[PDB]
Amino acid sequence: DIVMTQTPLSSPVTLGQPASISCRSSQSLLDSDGHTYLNWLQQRPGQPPRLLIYSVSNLESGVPDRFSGSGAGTDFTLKISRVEAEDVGVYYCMQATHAPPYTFGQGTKLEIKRTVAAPSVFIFPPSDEQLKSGTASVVCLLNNFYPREAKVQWKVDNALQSGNSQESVTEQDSKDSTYSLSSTLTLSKADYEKHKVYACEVTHQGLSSPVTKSFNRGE
Amino acid sequence: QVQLQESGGGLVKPGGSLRLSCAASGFTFSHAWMHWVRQAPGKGLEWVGQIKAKSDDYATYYAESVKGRFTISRDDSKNTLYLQMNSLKTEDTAVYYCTCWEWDLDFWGQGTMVTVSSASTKGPSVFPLAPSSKSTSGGTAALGCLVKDYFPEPVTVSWNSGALTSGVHTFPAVLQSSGLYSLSSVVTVPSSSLGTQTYICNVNHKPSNTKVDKKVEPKS
């Protein structure tokens, strides 16, 4: 049984700075024919895995030469000399010598650092066709910001809310390497009908002061 | 050119059965070795099994995690690769990938989602995120549609049948209190194009077979 151990990520690599990932196997990958069957895969978010470097150091067609391959026996290294916003993803390493079975590594997720970008804030009232179903959902949107750390607070008729909000965030984009956030305040139609002012206060490092986007029910 | 497309995923009760199909086109199929690999939600990659050609008498090999329960087939006359999985378990909930491993080429399919659970399927409800009368921004405007109350998770959203991709955010789904998932997809578009252009989100829930296209418009 072969295992593939990878050194995890230590910090988000700043744009343009080099990066080093390494796989370390339990047993030697040098086969009898003389070849070392060690690959490197990359999985951009939403995409299936694709092959970057095969047989230690040989690149795949359509892969920039920034990527480098090296290693011998049980130790290998993946080298990127400059980091651009397309390299964000998970990297695996696969062996094919003692096969079957074929084995992968756990994966080294790569993150990128960039300039501080302030988010764009929007807010949507609940759908009038949704109030017929009984529930009212207010959505606040944060578009393209860095760093990922953003604070969202809801104020209904100037009253800080809690318990009835759910939020998710997007992975780092493959072009500008920024994140996007989505909050959702959810109330029943009767409780939503008992107020008027619905707000959304966003606090971010790139914002000199908390920015508010609000609407009034029925406007 | 070369294409691999799987099909057969959906919702299947534990201890059940399922038969996936992977149709290929672009290379010599009667000679290629075909593999299946799955990726569990928030997990890594796990090889499942391979199959060979007629020279090797269609010899199959399986990982011990699935041996005795999964069966790999291939129809060389149709260039189709199969995976008949019986006695399914909740661990098998993963995205199953079709791949061709060869010295000539390395190619992975798009993957299909197999979800193993005992809960019933529910189709989602799509509501338009219509911006209010206060378009506080200039030029840049945001609109979208929210998906609500569905299970399983693999839900697809495409805007204008694919003709709209730049500036689209399809957020990761949240888990609600009732065990249902919620998801909203938004897009940023020029405000001047609001009256001129018409934006439509296309929600497709394969397990429930719920295809819904909702047109987002400013209200009143």
Added chain:
Amino acid sequence: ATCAIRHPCHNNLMNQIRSQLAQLNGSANALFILYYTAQGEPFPNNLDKLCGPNVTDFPPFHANGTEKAKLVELYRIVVYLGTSLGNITRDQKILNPSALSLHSKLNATADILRGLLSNVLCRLCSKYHVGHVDVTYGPDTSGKDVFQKKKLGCQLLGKYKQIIAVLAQAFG
């Protein structure tokens, strides 16, 4: 000097290659009979000077020589046979649509060669680090006299009938 493969090649290549050659050798004569029977007169009678193994630019193969040498020559043959059968199958579908058995036994022979192509080209790459080979192709039969289109395809399956027995005899 430089060759690399993503994943390893098939086990027992020389057994697969020889099993591929021996399989082609068996179906060689059946494809010869199927062809000239579909062409009609004057081929099934003057089968000697119209359908013989006289093909001019056909690549060579010497039974002597190293395994690398015998395999690079085999690579040029299988490439030559691929472009010809693809042309001949195009030529025959316009001339003879009635014989759907000749079409299905021409598609079979075409696919066995392409499976043999990976076995031969990898073994060069994985063992001798060949990487790539410069080859030659046959003449195009797109616009030619119908009889020459029939005759050229006849002599090819005759030379192929005789050359495939040589290849199946060697190797091992």
